[PDB]
Amino acid sequence: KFELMPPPYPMNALEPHMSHTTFEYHWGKHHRAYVDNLNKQIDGTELDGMTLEDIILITYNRGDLLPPFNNAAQAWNHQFFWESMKPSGGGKPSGELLQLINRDFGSFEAFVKEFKAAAATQFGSGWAWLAYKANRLNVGNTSNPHPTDEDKKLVVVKTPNAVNPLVWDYSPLLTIDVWEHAYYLDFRNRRPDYISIFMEKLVSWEAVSSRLEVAKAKAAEREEEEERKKREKEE
């Protein structure tokens, strides 16, 4: 009974570049199959009633992917991907991001040309990602001596099929669907051509800024919890 969200943007008549027909297939068909299946599987599930993030984390099940992970990841992936798109808003995002970009990539342009390389990396079904480094070390000498700033990093990763950085806990910001179903119709296998267009004509740079803010907030919350743990240890 997870959300079959009506698409956030007008979607159908939203963009000339993306066909309404293509949209109908991508959302009308994939989501519906995913959601009923997700539902079907989650019938009689103790897992049912958890968050999508919880169900995804749960059935990835660490080393052994369990049966339900694939459906969920994709459902979430699809809507998260959805968030990234904008009704014709794109270019030169500025704010915390511009400052962050020159810190890592060195230019907004550099990041763009770096992100452009992803077309080549997928070699099949998958999702490319922009993410944050709020990462929990889970074992051994987990703590960092000489702990310092710039630990934070803006990272770009490639995920095959059903993978979301949450599985490895890097905070996701933006996503693209490289799975052929998404771009095949408009351009037949011209992924390079489709990519730059997405990069420029339609990505809510501001939605990504909002997400960055949310991530910074989560990192802060985590450090606060760590301080609370330290206080408990002291007491």
Partner: protein, 102 residues
């Protein structure tokens, strides 16, 4: 006959170009340094290393023969590779651990 490298699949690029290194974010890689020491390492994931100052002799386990690296080279050590790394002088090193994909 065949150099040891081909047999062990450590692919190397010799005297890498500045333009090539301009690509691939060669700069900003993490750094390592040593003087005279020997290290036994088993790589569980591939490492791309831009050595610079560091010179290293790698003797694959059991070998009576070695692979010697000098100046500016970029070596991709293989996954599951196990060998001993021996250096007698100053070492510099840039390292990125490339997992599957790049």
């Amino acid at each position: 006959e065949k150099p040891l490298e081909e047999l062990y699949n450590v692919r190397v690029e010799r005297n890498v170009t500045k333009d090539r290194l301009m690509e691939l974010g060669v700069p900003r890689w993490s750094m390592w340094k040593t003087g005279k020491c020997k290290l036994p390492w088993d790589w569980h994931v591939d490492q791309l290393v831009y050595i610079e100052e560091g010179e290293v002799r790698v003797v694959p386990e059991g070998s009576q023969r070695f692979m010697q690296f000098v100046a500016g080279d970029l070596v991709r050590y293989p996954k599951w590779f196990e060998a001993d790394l021996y250096f007698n002088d100053f070492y510099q090193e840039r390292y990125s651990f490339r997992a599957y994909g790049d």
